[PDB]
Short mmCIF file of all heavy atoms in Angstrom, two decimals:
data_model
loop_
_atom_site.label_atom_id
_atom_site.label_comp_id
_atom_site.label_asym_id
_atom_site.label_seq_id
_atom_site.Cartn_x
_atom_site.Cartn_y
_atom_site.Cartn_z
N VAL B 185 63.96 127.08 63.77
CA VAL B 185 65.35 126.96 63.32
C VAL B 185 66.17 128.14 63.87
O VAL B 185 65.67 129.26 63.98
CB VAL B 185 65.47 126.83 61.77
CG1 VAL B 185 64.92 128.05 61.05
CG2 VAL B 185 66.91 126.58 61.35
N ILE B 188 73.37 130.81 63.63
CA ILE B 188 74.45 131.74 64.00
C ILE B 188 75.30 132.02 62.76
O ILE B 188 75.37 131.20 61.84
CB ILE B 188 75.40 131.16 65.09
CG1 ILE B 188 74.61 130.58 66.27
CG2 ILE B 188 76.38 132.22 65.58
CD1 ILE B 188 75.42 129.67 67.16
N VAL B 190 79.26 134.15 62.25
CA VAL B 190 80.37 135.05 62.59
C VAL B 190 81.37 135.01 61.43
O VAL B 190 81.52 133.98 60.78
CB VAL B 190 81.05 134.65 63.92
CG1 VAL B 190 82.22 135.57 64.25
CG2 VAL B 190 80.03 134.65 65.06
N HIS B 191 82.03 136.14 61.18
CA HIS B 191 83.01 136.25 60.09
C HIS B 191 84.19 137.13 60.49
O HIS B 191 84.00 138.30 60.82
CB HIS B 191 82.33 136.84 58.84
CG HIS B 191 83.29 137.23 57.75
ND1 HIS B 191 83.76 138.51 57.59
CD2 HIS B 191 83.87 136.49 56.77
CE1 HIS B 191 84.58 138.56 56.56
NE2 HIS B 191 84.67 137.34 56.04
N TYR B 193 87.82 138.69 59.09
CA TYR B 193 88.64 138.89 57.90
C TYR B 193 89.83 139.82 58.14
O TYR B 193 89.87 140.94 57.63
CB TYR B 193 87.79 139.43 56.75
CG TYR B 193 87.18 140.79 57.01
CD1 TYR B 193 87.50 141.88 56.22
CD2 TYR B 193 86.29 140.98 58.06
CE1 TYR B 193 86.95 143.12 56.45
CE2 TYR B 193 85.73 142.22 58.30
CZ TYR B 193 86.06 143.28 57.50
OH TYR B 193 85.51 144.52 57.74
N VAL B 201 79.56 129.30 60.76
CA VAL B 201 78.22 129.15 60.18
C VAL B 201 77.54 128.02 60.94
O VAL B 201 78.18 127.01 61.21
CB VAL B 201 78.28 128.79 58.68
CG1 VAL B 201 76.87 128.61 58.11
CG2 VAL B 201 79.05 129.85 57.91
N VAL B 206 64.69 122.51 65.61
CA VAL B 206 64.04 121.92 66.79
C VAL B 206 62.54 121.73 66.54
O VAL B 206 61.86 122.66 66.11
CB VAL B 206 64.25 122.80 68.05
CG1 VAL B 206 63.58 122.16 69.27
CG2 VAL B 206 65.73 123.02 68.31
N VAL B 210 54.14 121.31 72.87
CA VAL B 210 53.78 122.05 74.09
C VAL B 210 52.28 121.93 74.31
O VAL B 210 51.54 121.68 73.36
CB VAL B 210 54.19 123.54 73.98
CG1 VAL B 210 53.93 124.29 75.28
CG2 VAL B 210 55.65 123.67 73.57
N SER B 213 47.77 126.17 78.49
CA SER B 213 47.06 126.20 79.78
C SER B 213 46.57 127.62 80.11
O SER B 213 45.36 127.87 80.12
CB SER B 213 47.96 125.65 80.89
OG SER B 213 48.15 124.26 80.75
N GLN B 217 51.34 131.23 81.77
CA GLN B 217 52.10 129.99 81.61
C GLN B 217 52.66 129.81 80.19
O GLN B 217 53.83 129.49 80.04
CB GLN B 217 51.25 128.78 82.01
CG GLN B 217 50.89 128.74 83.49
CD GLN B 217 50.07 127.53 83.89
OE1 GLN B 217 50.05 126.51 83.19
NE2 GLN B 217 49.40 127.62 85.04
N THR B 218 51.82 130.03 79.17
CA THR B 218 52.27 129.91 77.77
C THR B 218 53.33 130.95 77.38
O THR B 218 54.18 130.68 76.53
CB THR B 218 51.08 129.96 76.76
OG1 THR B 218 51.52 129.50 75.48
CG2 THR B 218 50.52 131.38 76.62
N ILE B 223 59.28 130.72 76.18
CA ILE B 223 60.51 131.46 76.49
C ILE B 223 61.52 130.54 77.15
O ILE B 223 62.71 130.56 76.82
CB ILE B 223 60.18 132.67 77.41
CG1 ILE B 223 59.76 133.89 76.58
CG2 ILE B 223 61.36 133.04 78.31
CD1 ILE B 223 58.70 133.65 75.52
N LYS B 224 61.03 129.75 78.11
CA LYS B 224 61.82 128.71 78.78
C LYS B 224 62.42 127.71 77.78
O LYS B 224 63.60 127.37 77.89
CB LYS B 224 60.95 128.01 79.83
CG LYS B 224 61.63 126.96 80.68
CD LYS B 224 60.65 126.38 81.68
CE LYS B 224 61.26 125.25 82.48
NZ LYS B 224 60.27 124.63 83.41
N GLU B 230 68.75 127.84 73.32
CA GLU B 230 69.78 128.80 72.89
C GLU B 230 71.03 128.80 73.79
O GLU B 230 72.13 129.09 73.31
CB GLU B 230 69.20 130.22 72.80
CG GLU B 230 68.15 130.39 71.71
CD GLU B 230 67.66 131.82 71.55
OE1 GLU B 230 68.07 132.70 72.34
OE2 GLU B 230 66.86 132.07 70.62
N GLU B 239 81.75 125.60 73.90
CA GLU B 239 82.52 124.58 74.64
C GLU B 239 82.96 123.37 73.83
O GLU B 239 84.02 122.81 74.12
CB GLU B 239 81.74 124.08 75.87
CG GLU B 239 81.42 125.16 76.89
CD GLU B 239 80.87 124.61 78.19
OE1 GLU B 239 80.40 123.45 78.21
OE2 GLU B 239 80.89 125.34 79.20
N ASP B 246 89.59 121.69 68.20
CA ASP B 246 91.03 121.50 68.46
C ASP B 246 91.50 120.05 68.27
O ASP B 246 92.58 119.84 67.75
CB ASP B 246 91.42 122.00 69.86
CG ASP B 246 92.92 122.00 70.10
OD1 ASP B 246 93.70 122.28 69.16
OD2 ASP B 246 93.34 121.71 71.25
N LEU B 252 92.64 115.62 61.65
CA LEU B 252 92.94 115.83 60.23
C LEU B 252 94.45 116.05 60.05
O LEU B 252 95.11 115.26 59.38
CB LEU B 252 92.11 117.00 59.67
CG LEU B 252 91.90 117.13 58.15
CD1 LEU B 252 93.24 117.28 57.44
CD2 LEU B 252 91.13 115.96 57.57
N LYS B 262 109.69 116.68 66.40
CA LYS B 262 109.83 117.35 65.10
C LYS B 262 110.60 116.42 64.17
O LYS B 262 111.68 115.95 64.53
CB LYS B 262 110.58 118.67 65.23
CG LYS B 262 109.77 119.80 65.86
CD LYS B 262 110.60 121.06 66.02
CE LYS B 262 110.87 121.75 64.69
NZ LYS B 262 111.66 123.00 64.87
N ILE B 268 114.94 111.55 57.15
CA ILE B 268 114.10 111.35 55.96
C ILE B 268 114.91 111.09 54.68
O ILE B 268 114.53 110.25 53.86
CB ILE B 268 113.10 112.54 55.79
CG1 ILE B 268 111.94 112.37 56.77
CG2 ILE B 268 112.58 112.66 54.35
CD1 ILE B 268 110.95 113.51 56.82
N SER B 270 118.00 109.82 54.34
CA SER B 270 118.94 108.70 54.39
C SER B 270 118.44 107.54 55.27
O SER B 270 119.20 106.98 56.07
CB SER B 270 120.31 109.19 54.86
OG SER B 270 120.26 109.64 56.21
#
Side-chain angles (χ1 to χ4, degrees):
Chain B
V185 62
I188 312 164
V190 179
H191 170 264
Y193 63 118
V201 179
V206 181
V210 185
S213 290
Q217 294 181 20
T218 195
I223 274 49
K224 183 179 176 183
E230 295 185 355
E239 299 190 341
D246 187 36
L252 199 300
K262 286 177 73 179
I268 282 175
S270 66

